[PDB]
Amino acid sequence: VYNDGYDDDNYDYIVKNGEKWMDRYEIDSLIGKGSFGQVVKAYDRVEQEWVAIKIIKNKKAFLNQAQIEVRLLELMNKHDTEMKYYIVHLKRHFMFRNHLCLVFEMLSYNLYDLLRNTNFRGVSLNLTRKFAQQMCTALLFLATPELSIIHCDLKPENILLCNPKRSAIKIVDFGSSCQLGQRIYQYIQSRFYRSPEVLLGMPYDLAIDMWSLGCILVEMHTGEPLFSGANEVDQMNKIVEVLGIPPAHILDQAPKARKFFEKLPDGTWNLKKTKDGKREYKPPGTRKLHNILGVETGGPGGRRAGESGHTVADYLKFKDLILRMLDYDPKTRIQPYYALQHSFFKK
Ligand SMILES: CN(c1ccccc1)c1nccc(-c2cnn3ncccc23)n1
Secondary structure (H helix, E strand, O other), rough: OOOOOOOOOOOOEEOOOEEEEOOOOEEEEEEEEEEEEEEEEEEOOOEEEEEEEEOOOOOOOHHEEEEEEEHHHHHHOOOHHOOOHHHHEEEEEEOOOOOEEEEEOOOOOOOHHHHOOOOOOOHHHHHHHHHHHHHHHHHHHHHHOOOOOOOOOOOOHEEEEOOOOOOEEOOOOOOOEEEEOOOOOOOOOOHOOOOOOHOOOOOOOHHHHHHHHHHHHHHHHOOOOOOOOOHHHHHHHHHHHHOOOOOOHHHOOOHHHOEEEEEEOOOEEEOOOOHHOOOOOOOOOOOHHHHHOOOOOOOOOOOOOOOOOOOOHHHHHHHHHHHOOOOOOOOOEEEEEOOOOOHHHHH
């Protein structure tokens, strides 16, 4: 018996279809699950519109985190700019049966589902560019100094289509977000999208969201994750396959440098020695993004050969932007305002 019967063994509310809450919300169905809890589809009879309700887990640590999310959402949603409409609208929140409930506008499926619908062939470069320009505008909005918000968990699952059959998107799930002054975690971001500074245990800022976006944009067009580590060591080695050893000035300041690397007598860094010399990774920098993208050979896996909107010039512009988003140095990684000025977005 958990929560007088309303909860399961995992601090989640046992969702029951057709239930009416507070003589206002008619619960249609469960639409998603997460570590935070659940999201249900409901009808708001008062405002006479469909809404999405995020049911936070009935547990203190998750509740405390969702309060941070509420503060950041309300701060973004009230800002006086047009750029704020790339962030999901939090309509209201309430406590119900000892669960914090966040009521959002109803959106459509996420960009992972969209990838699944192409059977992981990836979406067109033209559609990728549309996602990239919106996400860049969103990161610019998060970067306005009064906000200074780090999403901290950008991934295809947290970018949603507004309408299933249009290209407009919004960012959701600010559950792990923080502001530039108020960072409280060290193990952050979903692993595939985790920045080098986080893996190395170094200080981080809004630039970690730009790293995630670079990884996301490649995956949206190729259909598969750029860096699919099974654990942190595997994740760092997969980044090194594509981008080489991180530069010495970063590793010299990285608290977790020796989790992946060793410093040589001359002050240069290499990967840690592997067991009995067992070969597992491409040598550093030899898994070229130029070839992952198929810049000159018809796109990813050659699947865009003979298609418009996929010229070598297009791919070269795309690759340059991605590499600027994946700069090892968070101080020189491209920032949203300048990313928006990139030749990849000239049309
Ligand atoms: C349509 N819908 C949705 C889509 C996919 C999966 C689950 C729900 C939806 N629509 C509007 C807002 C949200 C929403 C706000 N915060 N989070 N956090 C985490 C996850 C979702 C959301 N989800």
